[PDB]
Design a protein around this nucleic acid. Structure first.
Lengths: 190, 95, 65
DNA sequence: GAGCATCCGGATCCCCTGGAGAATCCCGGTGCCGAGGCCGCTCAATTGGTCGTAGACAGCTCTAGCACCGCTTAAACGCACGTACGCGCTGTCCCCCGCGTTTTAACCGCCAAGGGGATTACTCCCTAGTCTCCAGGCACGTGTCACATATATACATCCTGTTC
DNA sequence: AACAGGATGTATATATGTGACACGTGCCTGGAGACTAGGGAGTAATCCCCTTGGCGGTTAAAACGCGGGGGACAGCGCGTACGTGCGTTTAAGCGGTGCTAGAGCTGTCTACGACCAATTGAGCGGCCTCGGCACCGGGATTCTCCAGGGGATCCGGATGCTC
């Protein structure tokens, strides 16, 4: 812990702390890596260049951040807050431990049928003139539970019945007729 | 017949069977070739050639047995030129 | 010891194969001899566990190789 | 025109590069002083060397027949082509340690002497093998007959391995 | 969820030759017999040297837990490198002839056995003296700690859109 490493090069590091103002959302030094982690939007995670780009909006170009990132990753590993994926498909992709619980691997079918219906919902009205409406094709029950038509139909009735506000119920015949009006514009008839 | 697993079938047969694996006369002309440089017109009997062949076969088999264990040591299966270097030197032969 | 191998080998007369088998089987006999060459002795089966891919030849992750 | 979190260029600061003086360390290079190799006197049995003769192993001479270098076709093995996935090699960091740095004083270690037991010289006597000096039975070849299990074949019929 | 396909491993009786033994003769050499004979061992006294411990006095090698760097184990993966499938060709055995010397008969010389005394070597055997080795005081050698003006690249800040 020699002087040429504790006082000679130090002044740069304490001088630049907790000042990532340009990214207003969570500018804390410890939270930049984590903010990149939620912003990545991928199962594998963020690799080195991905995390560097996601952190880089301003205030960060890397005079010493290239090695400071490795040092912070070592600190986060000592804290046990990092979960990652190996392989050459993802060149050291990293994630923060966001309770995305690890479990046994086997049981990976080569399709995702439940989300396979979403692209068709995106495509069909968008291919039509009437743009993609609000997520009304399937309700919140779609990821509440996973059941067939009778159980996915009885529950919306309870959803609407438990909300007994007449004023709230008035909106279902004032926000929906907009679709009826737009059905005149997008197709020429019916 | 997968080539990797068929070789296992050969191992069972060749280990069970007892025979001279290398050709006789090509080995017989081989030992004669070496003798000429050492001593010109050095003759060989039938028994001498077979005795040399059997000793050579056993010596090569033992080296193959040792090099096989060198491959699994390196988390591998096939024999590479590095395997024969480690086995020979560690026996005190190469150096 | 060799004579017992002949019965296991479905043969009456002792062949050089049984001489190797008797010596190799007895570990004490290995110390006495075994750094030698036996004419037509053969080799005892010594298959290693690194071979024989008992697991399915398909890839661990999925069926595709 | 505003409000909010994604990018873009403005201006003030400090760590790469480099050459030394700071005072530490650890490691090389002279000083110093004991102990194991020598030199010189004697002390004597091993042990070469000498004097003088006798009993066999082995290079010549060459013999008689068996075991290898060519002859002479007849079958079967090995050698050669391509195509494919099994499996090197790279890239990468879980994650689990080998190594550095300090306590920590007890353990390895050498100094000044004795004893009881055990390993070589010296003397006596003794029972196997070892020349005499001959004898007879086993056990190895050369003919002469005559067989027994190994090594692969005809029928007849299941287990194993590697794909789709 | 599990059947097809072609060859290898099974029983079962079926052929052959070479490996094996049994006669019948024949003849040294390897065991056996039975004493006389000289030399390695059983068995008695002698004598110093070897190991077992007293018995203290510093000092350099263990014994152990914490720290922060990093290297072995292990995951996938795209492309390189080696073992099946099918074919003709030319390398291997036969196995009677023929031709070298290995191996086996004669008879003589030679260096090597063997008794018997003198005479140089070369450690013992207790007596003195010496030159490089090894321990121990001094500093020399790369890394380690400092002081300087500022610089180029960063952290500090300037600037962009649709209901």
């Amino acid at each position: 812990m020699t002087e040429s490493l504790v006082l000679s090069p130090a002044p740069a590091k304490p001088k630049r702390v907790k000042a990532s103002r340009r990214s207003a959302s969570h500018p804390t030094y410890s939270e930049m890596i984590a903010a990149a982690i939620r912003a990545e939007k991928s199962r594998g995670g963020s690799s080195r260049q991905s995390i560097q780009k996601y952190i880089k909006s301003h205030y960060k170009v890397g005079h010493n951040a290239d090695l400071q990132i490795k040092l912070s990753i070592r600190r986060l590993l000592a804290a046990g807050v990092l979960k990652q994926t190996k392989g050459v498909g993802a060149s050291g992709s990293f994630r923060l431990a966001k309770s995305d619980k690890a479990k046994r691997s086997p049981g990976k079918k080569k399709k995702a049928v439940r989300r396979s219906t979403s692209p068709k919902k995106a495509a069909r009205p968008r291919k039509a003139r009437s743009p993609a409406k609000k997520p009304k094709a399937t309700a919140r029950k779609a990821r509440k539970k996973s059941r067939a038509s009778p159980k996915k139909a009885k529950k919306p009735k309870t959803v609407k019945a438990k909300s007994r506000k007449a004023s709230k119920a008035k909106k279902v015949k004032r926000s929906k007729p907009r679709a009826k009006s737009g059905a005149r514009k997008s197709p020429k008839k019916k | 017949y997968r080539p990797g697993t068929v070789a296992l079938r050969e191992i069972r047969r060749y280990q069970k069977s007892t025979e001279l694996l290398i050709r006789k006369l090509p080995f017989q002309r081989l030992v004669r070739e070496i003798a000429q440089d050492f001593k010109t017109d050095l003759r060989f009997q039938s028994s001498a050639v077979m005795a040399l062949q059997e000793a050579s076969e056993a010596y090569l088999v033992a080296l193959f047995e040792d090099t096989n264990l060198c491959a699994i040591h390196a988390k591998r299966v096939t024999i590479m030129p590095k395997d024969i270097q480690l086995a020979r030197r560690i026996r005190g032969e190469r150096a | 010891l060799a004579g017992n191998a002949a019965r296991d080998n479905k043969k009456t007369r002792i062949i050089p194969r049984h001489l190797q088998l008797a010596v190799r089987n007895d570990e004490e006999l290995n110390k006495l001899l075994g750094r030698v060459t036996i004419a037509q002795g053969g080799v005892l089966p010594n298959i290693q566990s690194v071979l024989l891919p008992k697991k399915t030849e398909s890839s661990k992750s999925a069926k595709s190789k």
